[PDB]
């Protein structure tokens, strides 16, 4: 008969989501109800019926009694877990009540930048029983597991949280319990609008104004400068993200501007070629194309992407 | 009858307030008076009436006597708390005197950048009893809890400190004590004046001087360069702050300049268009507008913000 | 007669490969089966036949019985190893079952940047018995040692994993066991294409378009600007890597552009020299060379490297 | 009768002085002579008369004997103190000899940037007795406390060290001992000369040379470029320092250049205005002012500061 | 009679040499043979003749027997030392065999940047006996102390390693043992050639080509731009190094270029002054100087340094 273990995991804080290293960090409380008959005791009245134990001596106790604790790992933990509380309460009955507060970092291998910055993502913590389900079953501690209401995370905003149980075969080849706390968040795009999109559109629009000057040299010098500008924005954006082998939506948008800008140069080179060759008045005829290919090439662009990537 | 616990928390240092990660860090002393009748002892004369204990053995003592300690957590702690002292003194009476010095980082989810850089903010530490108020009540240790007077924090300057008690329901569903040390600080704006405001005004004013040259090409080249300048200041400022989904006052000020600057380009494009079209003397007439739209567009700006955001 | 130790090492995560410091970091589980008859006990009917031990007390047990544990080191460990689990299970038989989960960083002195960014690399962890092979032999725990399938590492992609045994003479001058987990990964070049190659080609190609303007001044000013651009890319790339004493393929590609660009200047200086000397129409004759030396000098370049370094 | 405690604190290394966070870091040894009669023991002749103890068991000893240790804190410690040695030697007499080696970071709230980079500063470590001077008095361990002669700190250079005693009232309201190790260092200005002063003077002087070209356009374009240059130097320097609410000497020097440069623009705008208005030969007359206002405005500057801030 | 202690220190890795903070970091094994007759034991046929001990219980053993351990410190250790192994083996004879693996950072106050980047440097670790040479003598454990051949450090390359013994007077005023592991390394200059020297020479050489255009304006604009370029390289290089009060060879090389570049401006200003004054054909005569002062001023420079600093 497998004895049941009641796994609660609440997340008081999201300290931060480092999307470049594909992890997130949380202040969290873990809560475990586990009844061991064998840990039951009897108290004379005037001696409390609930014992309070440092995990340190609670385990040194289980080791004397050679009782098995339902040993667990956080499977997607990264680095150290700076514990605040590791505290046992034990009723006459032998119901163990373990609480574990901590800061730690966790793997988010659930990261899909395909649609960056528009993407929504899955963050999850895996609590695994080391021991199989013949010995210990994880059940859902009720009215606890979830996300608190002072997470302090400004870029992301959490759509929904789910709790569920399932199995693994990590160290055992017997099926073992895995309690899972999943949450999706999606990205507050203000930052991106404000720092990336708005500037780029300013640069593109102001750039276009200088077309009404009808100086093709000054257009080419301008468009050439824009190129480096975008190539910069290319490095601003690259450094938010990993060295992905896959192509972001952002990546398209930029290479988009690159292509246009290069052809703005090439086009105005050829308009300027015609002034150089005594066809000034023809270049002036063709000019109206050049002037209304700018906004259309960049709006043809807005639907090359918004279709291809939506 | 719940036995009372006397919670003092002093802050010797503000090591720093990291506003990008929305936390702060402090060197702090915690002080607890808690009388346990059962911890009372009797001393032969020539043996001190005050026992001095490593927390390590003080808890191993409480575990022998199966006495409950008023276990607490720092609810808004982030990461590890590098303790210096964890020291118990115990009178014949059984009055426990716990002292806990530490450096730690703390969540400041109280962060309102709406008015950055002019904002004032709330920093607070939450000390929670794990156990309900049926067992332990937190009371305010008098003549201790507050902030020291070499905090060493130069950007912020602390308006006031408040201490008060209240409840939580973190692990228990019984009401539990929470001792709170709140402080407000506000921001020394020297840095912002010196590095952001002064430059931007210089750039804007000097820029304007070159209008009296009456070269519309040279105005457009100039205003176009200012744009990138501001777009830079846009990234200087962005990196002090998180990737907020909300719009700073700073954010406005910049997008403010962006809008004007773009229209400075557009306007001087059109003045220059008139020289190109044999209306040089008209463009020269209109010029006085162009020359006194600069200072007014940027002072119309000073009240677009100072109203919208005050 | 040496007692055998059964060494399993699985890698649940690659937290990251820091190629500048020539190390990598992993979440990993170590598993050891080791039968000590002397640890055998009697599994009295009704009493559990499997003892569960904190490493802490398991070693304090071996120290009472003065039994030797097969002490091991991770030979290529760097810094601290933040352990999650260090857990012993011991049958009546005296079969010790040690599990050790951890995050740690590891030396990758196997790093060959000669072909960066095209290179493939060897990452390996060395688990050494401190004690010789007269006392303890490492054997391969079967159906465990390998790499998990949520590593979360986006730039690298793992070709293959190998496990094998061998010896060392680190502290002993007697031969000692070394269990080795090797893996090769190779680099997703998207990043490099997207951020380095594409831009550089844009700069080079757009640059070339402005040749059809037939302004040698404007070519020289342009090529001079490209130089600094590349010199920048030289610092972008330098800082992904160590301060190598050996010359990358990347290093060549850049110095490649440098050489061409400098000679583009020198060539167009001399074309412009001829306009200055009343041989405008000759410079115009020679121009066709200048215009079709650009694409050929940079494609002569594409096979100076692709041969020299392949 | 208060028993005396003999406090030695030597600083083997200055690991570094982080002036932006207003702290410094040191490798240090602490040494304490403290005679407890009650810890005295009797040596049967041929048995050693000096006991050597891990602090771990030395305190577990004091806890058995319920003897009070003269518990101390480092009052201006920041974060963790990575101890190397914590070692007790105890003679027949009962003379405790505690040694404590460590790396730690310390608050330097003694930081006066008013004269940066010319400033000299106070670094100090506070060792406080937790217990009052009715129980324990701190006295100066002689021929130990000071600074070593391989600190390895290159920017600062230590003028003098002082050791002295005083009181506090941190946790007690009884007077308590505080042993203090103060040192002043002052700043090797080479760095500042080499990277800040020399460049700025070059920029200013070379800039001035181009005046002898008598092109007022080319002066205005030049002075405008200098402005951004200085605005850069403004950010180089700002980031060495905190976000001070007070105004550095450095801050003046820069805003100095800003003011001049802006008025260089304004002046040459007006010289150029006169060429635009058919008064070319007058602008040429006035020119000699413009040419010898540059060196005088920037040398009028050298005594606006060298007086105001000396 | 002082009992002898046999000190071996091997360095498996150089994790890195941080030259800006003047330290280095190493994975290392420490090995100590120390015979204590008093720890000698006798066994029945069955119990091994070599006892294996956690340092934890080995010291708790020495504390029972009140035996003195030859306590040591790493004198030039910085921060924490993340230990992997701390393992005692003890023969019947009472020969203690302590092994200590670790990562730690170490002071290199042996740092002479005078000749940067050409400099060679001394790295050393100091292992000190706390106790004098009346009690414990350090002797050299043979066939161990040295450096391994997978250090993994790419910029430096180790010339030679030395071991020797000597004394200190750190805490004692009696002479005490200090085992020293010294190594010299020198710097792979590839990085510096590739990123600093090559560019600077390109900039200087290409710059010179544009002289054959015979446009003194375009030379002055060019040389002025070079200045800022070098002033940038001045900040690249400054930040590899500390804020030394002493002047690098690098520092000279840069200030070298600064001086020349400024005088290139000044000279071409004066050539251009002569065109402005109707002496165009004279400036053209003098030009040949200007054109062959560039390569000579910068090669006169190559021996101003290579003599002054060699
Ligand atoms: C690239 C294709 C078409 C021409 C555009 C090139 C730039 C136009 C003039 O600006 C200059 O650009 C340099 C690098 O290009 C900068 O280093 C320099 O400070 C800037 O003054
Ligand atoms: C840039 C959009 C604004 C266009 C309006 C005319 C402004 C032209 C001046 O800026 C130029 O821009 C390039 C990058 O675009 C820079 O490389 C170059 O140093 C700079 O001289
Ligand atoms: C801005 C100061 C106003 C006073 C007059 C000086 C004119 C200088 C404007 O050209 C600048 O050229 C740089 C090329 O390196 C650009 O990067 C920069 O954006 C652009 O503004
Ligand atoms: C070096 C090869 C010969 C031609 C190019 C000369 C040096 C680099 C060109 O960029 C220059 O750099 C400055 C920004 O740093 C600008 O102020 C300047 O106007 C711009 O043109
Ligand atoms: C390895 C775990 N930290 C040990 C533990 C697990 C469950 C309970 Br209930 C108590 C202790
Ligand atoms: C910080 C730990 N909860 C330990 C503790 C022990 C005693 C008292 Br009084 C308060 C707390
Ligand atoms: C050095 C290791 N941490 C100690 C140890 C090794 C092997 C086994 Br089986 C148990 C404990
Ligand atoms: C809190 C300190 N770690 C305890 C201590 C202080 C002084 C001496 Br002497 C020994 C121990
Ligand atoms: C500082 C060390 N913890 C003490 C030590 C040194 C040497 C030997 Br042998 C054993 C212990």
Q: Are C290 and C271 in contact (CB under 8 A)?
A: yes
- What DSSP string runs through B36-99? -GGG-----TTS-SEEEEEHHHHHHHHHHTTPPP--EEETTEEEEEEEEEEEEEEETT-EEEEE
Q: Rounded distance, CA C78 to CA E152, Å? A: 12
Q: How many helices (H) and strands (E) does chain C have?
A: 6, 11
Interface contact flag, C22 E199, Cβ < 8 Å: no
Report whether the peptide linkage leading into residue E184 is cis, meaning its omega lies within 30 degrees of zero: no
Nearby residues of B201 by Cβ (< 8 Å), 6 or more positions away: none
Cα-based distances in Å from B300 to A187, B303, B307: 34, 6, 11
Token readout for B49 is 């009436």
Q: Rounded distance, CA B67 to CA A47, Å? A: 9
E108: nearest CA in chain D? D152
Interface contact flag, C103 A77, Cβ < 8 Å: yes
Chains that touch E (3 or more CB pairs under 8 A): C, D
Q: Rounded distance, CA B68 to CA B3, Å? A: 11
Q: Does E58 touch chain D (CB under 8 A)?
A: no
Interface contact flag, A234 C194, Cβ < 8 Å: yes
Q: What are phi and psi of A64, to 5 degrees?
A: -60, -55
Q: Does A154 touch chain B (CB under 8 A)?
A: yes
Q: Are B253 and B233 in contact (CB under 8 A)?
A: no
* CA angle, C45 then C51 then C55, to 5°: 170
Q: Are D101 and D82 in contact (CB under 8 A)?
A: no
Q: Rounded distance, CA C84 to CA C86, Å? A: 7
Q: C137 - beta bridge partners?
A: C4
Q: Are D2 and D167 in contact (CB under 8 A)?
A: no
Identify the residue whose tokens are 């500008």: A229
Q: Rounded distance, CA E58 to CA E88, Å? A: 7
% helix, strand, coil for chain E, step of 5: 40, 35, 25
D172: nearest CA in chain B? B144
Among D85, D157, D190, whose Cβ lies nearest the Cβ of E71? D85
Q: Rounded distance, CA E168 to CA E175, Å? A: 6
Q: Rounded distance, CA A194 to CA A197, Å? A: 7
Q: Rounded distance, CA E52 to CA E58, Å? A: 9
Task: Give the number of C-alpha atoms closer than 13 A to the C-alpha of residue D34, restricted to the C-beta side.
Answer: 24
Q: Rounded distance, CA E193 to CA E215, Å? A: 31
Cα of A50 vs its chain's centroid, Å: 42
Rg for chain A, CA atoms, rounded? 31
| Kind plus residue range of the DSSP H or E element containing B198 | helix B198-209
Burial of residue D204 (CB within 10 Å: 0-12, 13-18, 19+) is buried
Nearby residues of C215 by Cβ (< 8 Å), 6 or more positions away: none
What number of residues does chain A have? 310
Q: Rounded distance, CA C237 to CA D8, Å? A: 51
The closest of C300, C280, C291, C278 to C209, measured between CA atoms, is: C291
Interface contact flag, E198 C258, Cβ < 8 Å: yes
The domain spans of chain E are 1-188, 189-310
Q: Rounded distance, CA C264 to CA C258, Å? A: 10
Q: Is A43 annotated as a binding residue?
A: yes
Q: Rounded distance, CA A70 to CA A89, Å? A: 16
Q: Tell me the three-class secondary structure of A127-192, residue by residue.
A: EEEEEECCCEEEEECCCCCEECCCCCCCCEEEEEEEEEEEEECCCCCCCEEEEEEEEEEEECCHHH
Q: Rounded distance, CA B241 to CA C290, Å? A: 50
Mutation choice for ligand 7 from C59, C61, C129, CB with most ligand atoms inside 8 A: C59
Q: How many CB atoms lie within 10 A of CB C281?
A: 9
Q: Does E7 touch chain C (CB under 8 A)?
A: no
Token readout for A299 is 């709006």
**E50 contacts in chain C (CB < 8 Å):** 68
Q: Rounded distance, CA D250 to CA C35, Å? A: 71
Token readout for A89 is 């309460």
Token readout for B221 is 């080249």
Q: What are phi and psi of B172, to 5 degrees?
A: -70, 160
Q: Give me the helices (H) in chain E, please.
A: 55-64, 190-192, 198-209, 216-238, 249-275, 280-308
Nearby residues of B103 by Cβ (< 8 Å), 6 or more positions away: B13, B15, B25, B26, B27, B28, B81, B82, D77, D78, D79, D80
Among C51, C85, C152, whose Cβ lies nearest the Cβ of A109? C152
| Kind plus residue range of the DSSP H or E element containing A91 | strand A77-91
Q: Where are the beta strands (DSSP E) in B133-223?
A: 136-140, 146-147, 156-168, 176-187
Rg for chain C, CA atoms, rounded? 30
Q: Are E186 and C245 in contact (CB under 8 A)?
A: no
Report whether the peptide linkage leading into residue E117 is cis, meaning its omega lies within 30 degrees of zero: yes
Q: How many CB atoms lie within 10 A of CB C249?
A: 18
Named by the residue before each, gaps in chain D exceeding 2.5 A from C to N are: none
The closest of B186, B181, B105 to B146, measured between CA atoms, is: B181
Q: Are D102 and B82 in contact (CB under 8 A)?
A: no
Rg for chain D, CA atoms, rounded? 31
Provide the 3-class DSSP secondary structure of residue A282.
Answer: helix
Q: Are D46 and D166 in contact (CB under 8 A)?
A: no
Q: Are D69 and B52 in contact (CB under 8 A)?
A: yes
Rg for chain B, CA atoms, rounded? 31
Token readout for A259 is 């292509």
Q: Rounded distance, CA E82 to CA E90, Å? A: 25
Cα-based distances in Å from E163 to A97, B81, D119, E126: 57, 40, 43, 11
Among B71, B238, B255, whose Cβ lies nearest the Cβ of A87? B71
Q: Rounded distance, CA B243 to CA C102, Å? A: 32
* Start-to-end C-alpha separation, chain D: 52
Q: Are D120 and D159 in contact (CB under 8 A)?
A: yes
Distance in Å, alpha carbon of E158 to nearest chain C alpha carbon = 13
Name the DSSP class of A30. E
Nearby residues of B177 by Cβ (< 8 Å), 6 or more positions away: B5, B7, B128, B129, B133, B136, B137, B138, B165, B167
Q: How many CB atoms lie within 10 A of CB B5?
A: 24
Q: Are C109 and E125 in contact (CB under 8 A)?
A: no
The closest of E223, B198, E53, E172 to D255, measured between CA atoms, is: B198
Q: Are A27 and B109 in contact (CB under 8 A)?
A: no
What number of residues does chain D have? 310
Q: Does A3 touch chain C (CB under 8 A)?
A: no
* Closest ligand to residue A55's CA: 5
Cα-based distances in Å from C205 to C208, C224, C270, C303: 5, 15, 22, 18
Q: Rounded distance, CA C209 to CA C229, Å? A: 18
* CA angle, E145 then E148 then E150, to 5°: 165
Chains that touch B (3 or more CB pairs under 8 A): A, D
Atom 2 in ligand 8: residue holding the nearest Cα: D71
Task: Give the number of C-alpha atoms closer than 13 A to the C-alpha of residue C301, restricted to the C-beta side.
Answer: 21
The closest of A16, A20, A30, A184 to A105, measured between CA atoms, is: A16
Nearby residues of A277 by Cβ (< 8 Å), 6 or more positions away: none
D218: left (phi over 0), alpha (psi -120 to 50) or beta: alpha
* Start-to-end C-alpha separation, chain E: 52
Q: What are phi and psi of C80, to 5 degrees?
A: -90, 155
Among E66, E81, E130, whose Cβ lies nearest the Cβ of D51? E66
Q: Does A91 touch chain C (CB under 8 A)?
A: no
Q: What are phi and psi of B250, to 5 degrees?
A: -45, -55
Report whether the peptide linkage leading into residue E230 is cis, meaning its omega lies within 30 degrees of zero: no
Name the DSSP class of B188. -
CB contacts < 8 Å between A and C, how many?
Answer: 144
Q: Are C88 and C52 in contact (CB under 8 A)?
A: yes
**D150 contacts in chain E (CB < 8 Å):** 76, 107, 109
The closest of E180, E94, E179, E90 to E139, measured between CA atoms, is: E179
The closest of C124, C23, C28, C129 to C83, measured between CA atoms, is: C28
Token readout for D233 is 């130097």
Nearby residues of D128 by Cβ (< 8 Å), 6 or more positions away: D72, D73, D74, D75, D168, D170, D176, D177, D178
Provide the 3-class DSSP secondary structure of residue A215.
Answer: coil
| Kind plus residue range of the DSSP H or E element containing B151 | none
Q: Rounded distance, CA B292 to CA B172, Å? A: 68
Question: What sign results for the dihedral spanned by CA atoms C148, C151, C154, C160?
Answer: negative
Interface contact flag, D269 B212, Cβ < 8 Å: yes
Report whether the peptide linkage leading into residue E228 is cis, meaning its omega lies within 30 degrees of zero: no
Q: Rounded distance, CA D275 to CA E125, Å? A: 72
| Kind plus residue range of the DSSP H or E element containing D70 | none
**C195 contacts in chain A (CB < 8 Å):** 234-235, 238
**A15 contacts in chain B (CB < 8 Å):** 21, 23, 78-79, 107
Q: What are phi and psi of C52, to 5 degrees?
A: -115, 120
Q: Where are the beta strands (DSSP E) in C115-219?
A: 120-132, 136-140, 146-147, 156-168, 176-187
Q: Are E68 and E132 in contact (CB under 8 A)?
A: no
Cα D9 to averaged position of ligand 2 atoms, centre (Å): 60
Burial of residue E308 (CB within 10 Å: 0-12, 13-18, 19+) is exposed
Residues in A 251-290 with any Cβ partner in B closer than 8 A: none
Q: E59 - beta bridge partners?
A: none
CB contacts < 8 Å between D and E, how many?
Answer: 145
Task: Give the number of C-alpha atoms closer than 13 A to the C-alpha of residue C122, restricted to the C-beta side.
Answer: 10
Q: Does E111 touch chain D (CB under 8 A)?
A: yes
Provide the 3-class DSSP secondary structure of residue B18.
Answer: strand
Buried b (16+ CB within 10 A) or exposed e, C120-135: ebebbbbbbbbbbbeb
Q: Is C154 annotated as a binding residue?
A: no
Q: How many CB atoms lie within 10 A of CB E150?
A: 14
Q: Rounded distance, CA E29 to CA E7, Å? A: 11
The closest of B114, B198, B120, B119 to B158, measured between CA atoms, is: B120
Nearby residues of C73 by Cβ (< 8 Å), 6 or more positions away: C127, C128, C130, C170, E84, E85, E101
The closest of D206, D223, D214, D201 to E267, measured between CA atoms, is: D206
Token readout for A206 is 């102001």
Name the DSSP class of E2. P
């Amino acid at each position: 008969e497998p004895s049941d273990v009641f796994i609660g995991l609440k997340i008081d804080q999201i300290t931060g989501i480092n999307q470049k290293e594909e992890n997130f960090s949380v202040v969290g409380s873990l809560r475990i109800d586990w009844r061991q008959p064998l840990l039951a005791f009897e108290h004379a009245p005037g001696e409390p019926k609930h014992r309070t134990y440092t995990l340190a001596t609670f385990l040194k106790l289980l080791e004397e009694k050679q009782i098995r604790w339902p040993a667990f790992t956080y499977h997607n933990q990264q680095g150290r877990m700076d514990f605040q509380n590791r505290l046992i309460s034990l009723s006459e009955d032998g119901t163990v009540m373990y609480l574990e507060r901590f800061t730690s970092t966790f793997q988010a291998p659930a990261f899909d930048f395909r649609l960056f910055p528009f993407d929504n993502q899955l963050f999850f913590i895996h609590v695994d029983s080391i021991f199989p389900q013949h010995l210990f079953r994880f059940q859902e501690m009720q009215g606890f597991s979830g996300l608190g209401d002072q997470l302090g995370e400004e870029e992301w905003i959490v759509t929904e949280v789910n709790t569920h149980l399932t199995t693994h075969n990590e160290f055992t080849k017997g099926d073992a319990s895995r309690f899972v706390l999943e949450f999706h968040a999606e990205r507050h795009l203000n930052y991106y609008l404000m720092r990336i999109l708005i500037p780029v559109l300013l640069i593109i629009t102001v750039s276009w104004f200088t077309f009404f000057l009808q100086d093709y040299t000054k257009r080419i010098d301008l468009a050439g400068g824009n190129l480096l500008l975008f190539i910069a924005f290319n490095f601003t954006i690259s450094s938010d993200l990993p060295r992905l082998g896959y192509i972001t939506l952002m990546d398209a948008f930029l290479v988009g501007t690159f292509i246009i800008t290069a052809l703005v140069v090439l086009g105005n080179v050829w308009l300027r070629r015609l002034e150089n060759h005594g066809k000034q008045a023809l270049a002036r005829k063709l000019d109206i194309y050049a002037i209304t290919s700018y906004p259309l090439a960049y709006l043809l662009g807005a639907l090359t992407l918004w279709l291809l990537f939506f």
